[PDB]
Design a protein around this ligand. Structure first.
Ligand SMILES: Cc1nc(C(=O)N2CCC[C@H]2Cc2nnc(-c3ccccc3)o2)c(-c2ccccc2F)s1
Length: 503
């Protein structure tokens, strides 16, 4: 009957110090300083500069503030508890510190969620993208408010235990801090809801969001603007056009080029051929030159070759070409025709535009994104008529200087490529941050959801090994705070510049 209290009476002074305590402390100290100077360096880096004041970076700042809170208040307490197995602070801090722990976790996760949502709208729904600084400094307050509000049961149930309840002998060596609930279903509910709210739902939703983002950004790395450069072409452009046409046995005229595999339902060379057939009449056809390059279906090649034989102003090339020569072609011709059906990337547009060629493309896929007004002509796909009309307009535009137009094409292509690259980078960084977060908060979450709902680690000598895993999980939790600034330092150039500048 009195076995528990007597065994506690015989073993109350039994201390069995862990061999590897100094490795814990060290780690805890490391993580401590690294989390401080790290996260502060983030805050400063955003606060001092004007170019660093992005919504994303404001969120990052909120995250760093939360992690700073954790590092300053919760880390030393956790170290002391994990190393002495006792609560050395007051009865009030017994409620305050774990509360702030929960709140901090909440704020962090929610902040990451707002980042992910922001990028999801930015990438996957450009037209609906709205991210003012007022939305940030206004939703962050919502995050802190909700976090502070929903974590009050944590503060409520925290109590400072000492010895077995209903025991007349209040004698003790040390006290502890743990959760004291009225019922037994209450812990299960609060902790299941805690696990779902602060880990399951947001990391799930964010996984989905970054899945859509990465699926949208896949295969879009841009082009090599070091190769596709007009600087490697000689002479003037009209001289290169005259030379090119003369080489094919043609007189000077407004030159249109096509290049791509011959498809009945993709690259739309058939639409082009039909368009040329449409243009076979009219008084404007002899002012035009057509260069059809590619290889594919025998029928389409026969069609193109027959048109080449029919008209003296149409040249068909089934010959395998070099990248340098294609580059020359883009920097000689006046217009490039991209009559694609579903073109998802549209690299020909970018390259041609980089080399001064003005694109005439079907307004589909990536071509819509790349080509705007003043930077090209857009056409309804699968419609030879509207294509022919666009070609006629291109002819009517060639009666002007067209220099600033080509320059606009260059600027457009370059800026587009750079934007997509930067996008790829930032998305990469945020994904890494999220991943590291998930990994860091995983073990303590499974251990917590096991301990507080599905049974517990409480029976017999199943504790002095569970203790180690628990302390490690805790340290990991605090280690995340030190992890984020390093990630920023290795995956964000501006943060690199700022970190380096701070010393
Ligand atoms: C040291 C830690 N304790 C926990 C933990 O079990 N809980 C329950 C819900 C939130 C957190 C709150 C808490 N309980 N004790 C402390 C504490 C804090 C400091 C010193 C001593 C005790 O903080 C941690 C935790 C668990 C899951 C998810 C996130 C967490 F932060 S970390």
């Amino acid at each position: 009957d009195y076995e528990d209290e007597f065994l506690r009476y015989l073993w109350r002074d039994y201390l069995y110090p862990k061999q590897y305590e100094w490795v814990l402390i060290a780690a805890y100290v490391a993580v401590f300083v690294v989390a401080l100077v790290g996260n502060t360096l983030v805050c400063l880096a955003v606060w001092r500069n004007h170019h660093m004041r992005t919504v994303t970076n404001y969120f990052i700042v909120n995250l760093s503030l939360a992690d700073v809170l954790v590092t300053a208040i919760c880390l030393p307490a956790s170290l002391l508890v994990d190393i002495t197995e006792s609560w050395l602070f007051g009865h009030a801090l017994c409620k305050v510190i774990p509360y702030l722990q929960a709140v901090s976790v909440s704020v962090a996760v929610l902040t990451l969620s707002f980042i992910a949502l922001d990028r999801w709208y930015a990438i996957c729904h450009p037209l609906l993208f709205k991210s003012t600084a007022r939305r940030a400094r206004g939703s962050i307050l919502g995050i802190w408010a909700v976090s502070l509000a929903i974590m009050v049961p944590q503060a409520a149930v925290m109590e400072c235990s000492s010895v077995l309840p209903e025991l007349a002998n209040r004698t003790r060596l040390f006290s502890v801090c743990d959760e004291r609930w009225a019922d037994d279903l209450y812990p299960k509910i609060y902790h299941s809801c805690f696990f779902i709210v602060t880990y399951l739902a947001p990391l799930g939703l964010m996984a989905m969001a970054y899945f859509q983002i990465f699926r949208k950004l896949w295969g879009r790395q841009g082009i090599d603007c070091s190769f596709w450069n007009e600087s490697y072409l000689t002479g003037s452009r009209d001289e290169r056009k005259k030379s090119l046409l003369s080489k094919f046995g043609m007189d000077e005229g407004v030159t249109f080029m096509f290049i791509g595999r011959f498809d009945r339902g993709q690259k739309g060379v058939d639409v082009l051929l039909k368009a040329i057939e449409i243009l076979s009449s009219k008084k404007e056809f002899q002012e035009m030159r057509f260069i059809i390059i590619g290889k594919g279906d025998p029928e389409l090649e026969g069609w193109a070759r027959s048109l080449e034989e029919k008209h003296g102003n149409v040249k068909v090339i089934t010959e395998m070409l070099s990248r340098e020569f294609v580059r020359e072609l883009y920097g000689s011709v006046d217009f490039v025709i991209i009559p694609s059906y579903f073109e998802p990337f549209g690299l020909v547009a970018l390259e041609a535009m980089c080399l001064g060629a003005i694109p005439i493309a079907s307004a589909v896929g990536g071509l819509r994104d790349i080509i705007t007004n003043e930077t090209g002509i857009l056409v309804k796909a699968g419609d030879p008529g509207e294509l022919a009309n666009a070609i006629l307009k291109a002819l009517e535009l060639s009666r002007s200087d067209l220099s600033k137009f080509r320059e606009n094409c260059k600027k457009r292509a370059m800026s587009f490529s750079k934007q997509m690259r930067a996008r790829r980078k930032t998305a990469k960084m945020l994904m890494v941050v999220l991943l590291v977060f998930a990994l860091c908060y995983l073990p303590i979450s499974v251990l917590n959801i096991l301990k507080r709902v599905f049974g517990m680690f409480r029976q017999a000598s199943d504790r002095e090994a569970v203790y180690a895993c628990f302390t490690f999980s805790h340290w990991l939790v605090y280690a995340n705070s030190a992890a984020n600034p390093i990630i920023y330092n290795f995956l964000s150039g501006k943060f690199r510049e700022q970190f380096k500048a701070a010393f």
